[PDB]
Amino acid sequence: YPEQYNYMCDIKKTLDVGGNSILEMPSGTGKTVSLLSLTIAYQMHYPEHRKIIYCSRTMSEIEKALVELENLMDYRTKELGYQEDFRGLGLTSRKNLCLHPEVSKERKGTVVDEKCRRMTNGQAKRKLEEVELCEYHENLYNIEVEDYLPKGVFSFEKLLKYCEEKTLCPYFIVRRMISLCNIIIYSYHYLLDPKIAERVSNEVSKDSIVIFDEAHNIDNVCIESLSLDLTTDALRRATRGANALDERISEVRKVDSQKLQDEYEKLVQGLXXXXXXXXXXXXXXXXXXXXXXXXXXXXXXXXXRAEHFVSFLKRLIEYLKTRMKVLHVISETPKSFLQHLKQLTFIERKPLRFCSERLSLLVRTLEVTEVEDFTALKDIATFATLISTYEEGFLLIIEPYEIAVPNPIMRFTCLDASIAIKPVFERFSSVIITSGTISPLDMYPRMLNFKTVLQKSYAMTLAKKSFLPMIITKGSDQVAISSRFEIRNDPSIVRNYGSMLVEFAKITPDGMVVFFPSYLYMESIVSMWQTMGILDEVWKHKLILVETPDAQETSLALETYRKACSNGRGAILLSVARGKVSEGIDFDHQYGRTVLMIGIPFQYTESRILKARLEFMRENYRIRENDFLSFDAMRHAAQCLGRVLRGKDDYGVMVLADRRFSRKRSQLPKWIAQGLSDADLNLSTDMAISNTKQFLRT
Amino acid sequence: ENKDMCPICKTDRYLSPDVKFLVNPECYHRICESCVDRIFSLGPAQCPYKGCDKILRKNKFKTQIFDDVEVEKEVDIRKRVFNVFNKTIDDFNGDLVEYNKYLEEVEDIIYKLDHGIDVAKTEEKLRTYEELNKQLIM
């Protein structure tokens, strides 16, 4: 297409000149546009030069990038007939990319890495003094296994079928292939990870092209990278964790004390640098981004041992129980909290180095370490690292007396979000920053200050196939401002609002997806709707997303929605616009052809996390009470806009309520304001003109 | 705890627990306010806390945020050991390994004083604390 070549000519001009480019793409029409241009810019330069680094936001976009790369290789092996050096690696999760917990453990949780380190150290125990390895170890690091990926594309699903037929291990293949540096596909929770990105950055070895995919929730990952709640039950875990270290120091000082004494001399000489260098293929500890923390020349509790280090920790946790034992609403400065700590116990200014050495020590010392006890130590050690350094932008908040039973909840606020995005500019050049759910894109020069260029979507044609209307008067224009309040004011109007939804769904019963800014509006009408005619004569079955949406429940509601439209039935997808599963897969008639939105998306106000980030960005960019209610409300609405635009071949109608949407912008701003009963006759025309103009424009 | 706060009135919460529960540093016993006012007004004897014999002294009590009996005693023992030695051979010249070896000896002597050892090295540390106090006078 000529519109796809407009962004491709900009991608061929920025990858060889600029270092970071904010390129806007239309929804459902920019997936393979930058995919083929990334392999063409490498083919125009050198094919072993800068490899492609993909950064998705969900696991679905990781899976959708693999099938498009197969189409890139099929277009390069059929139009050319030459099989070059293949690439592509499916860096997914650990519970999905495994074989051993899917046979004996039968658990698909976050404990798949615990059996991984038990088999890694079990193979280490079987190759030093002596369970053993696993099903297929001591063979995945061979040279023939390193050549199974530049010759054949085996990523994720193709590699999981390859590790069963050839009897291999999916963990040691992918971990040995980050050093090979292929087309790496991963999500946003791995690049800004304080336990994973320290290992990823030592294997890619830089000098590549970072492809930011759907870069609109970048400010959310930097907040989600920190902020851990301490809801007082970890104090019971830290109390039982402190007594376990007392029995472990009693067990270490009863017989085999030379293993701890030689480790004490190794920490008094080689410190943490030699301790990390000697430790290989074992369970790594935790830190607050060692590539961003930058600290050397440490000391082990001032030349002391583990018996003196656990005394400071037991001194530390009782002070933490002392500070949590407070009244209600109280803010805390991270520097002033450290001063009040030193008035209680002189723990110096470096507990960041007093914990990461002792976490690696107890793994080497205690062999049968408890799961809940050692994780209780890591929750304290992650907090001890954040109170030692990184005080600029940091803030400690206390939850108030909320019945008070659930009152002792301690949380720390993250620093600036520009700090986490900082080291990706000096490590990589020509970082392609793309997102299809941004309108406008001027907040990214504002918030997160980096020098970049701005390019908009230069693709807008065939407005007769992209119906973009909006509803204003709902028969009386009263339920539009009624949903604007946070509290469910006047439920009789909401029962009148829910009465209009049965009338709106009975007009076009051909795939309906309803989003919500909160689950309170879903739970308000579901108690006594008194209106099931659409749930018995139109949509029949009901697909409502709950607040506690299970992964299996979201999977079963998605497949049955595809089973409803493939049987001539149609279903109502009652989802949350602020909830999980942002979707993105459409391009068919099985999706909801008419998408409904209840008002505008809102945010949870009157919270200490919001009031802290309000005054933090007030000093930075002075965007108080503006972008927090509009730029955040747009991106939660733009996830609903990315599903209607499913290419130029498929049509779709997206209606928007209220009147506050006119103050913001939108992707392809062609919007006509009409009433609710007026659009019922307009959509009946749009569902018949588009069926007659499809064969006219071809 | 609520079940043990005083040898005479251990559970005064049903009878409105409006008084405090002092802890003597030479007894480490939960002693309430009302009973102890009769104690030091009539001489310095011992408390009968489970038949205790440690002689309670007049005044010199403390409020506690309950760091058990070990960490409540180890915090005052570390505070008494940080004032006698002060910052000798630590930050006098920007020393690091010599400061850490001097702090490891202060920590091991505090660990020997906290454990009690056998009243030999602690009595030697009592002379060393007397040596740290006599060196701060000259």
Ligand code: SF4
């Ligand atoms: S070697 Fe691989 S399959 Fe075996 S336990 Fe470890 S991660 Fe799981």
Ligand SMILES: [Zn+2]
């Ligand atoms: Zn009493």
Ligand SMILES: [Zn+2]
């Ligand atoms: Zn006593």
